[PDB]
Design a protein around this ligand. Sequence first.
Ligand SMILES: N#Cc1c(F)cc(O)cc1SCCS(=O)(=O)O
Length: 177
Amino acid sequence: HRELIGDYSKAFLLQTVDGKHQDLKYISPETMVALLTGKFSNIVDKFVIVDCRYPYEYEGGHIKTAVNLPLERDAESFLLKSPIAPCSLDKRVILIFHSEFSSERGPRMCRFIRERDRAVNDYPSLYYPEMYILKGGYKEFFPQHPNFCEPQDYRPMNHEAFKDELKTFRLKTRSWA
Ligand SMILES: N#Cc1c(F)cc(O)cc1SCCS(=O)(=O)O
């Protein structure tokens, strides 16, 4: 009972929960685990978990199999230089973006990739028609499913010991207010 995925080919596969960006689709930690455990494997050929946090955050504990792509230029290169395509036409590729709380950084990246994907395709085709945000980010995922994380820990962006690493990262970004 929702709208189609972004190339209007079919419905969203995963059950979604409410999130503050009302036009994006959010999933729970339980759904993320369903992907990781192959619950959807007959249909989902590939999925990419895009950890949008800074490298020190990712190094302090991330979801197994996640890729750390906090800079837009790096996310664009990884995802769109040579798009990640299912090995059967019957099957799907899904992207899941998250950040610490999935408040700002994850949603931002999700939108950016959609804008890029639209730009490089003939409307309405997309390389990544089906993208989700992990509701509550790493902060909510880790306490529920620690064995799906490595290392089994959680390093916040504003960790007191990583103030320098935060500044170092910010000076690599393409724009700030
Ligand atoms: N932006 C954005 C966006 C996205 F990243 C994933 C998604 O499921 C929906 C949206 S808002 C609609 C943008 S568009 O009409 O698909 O180009």
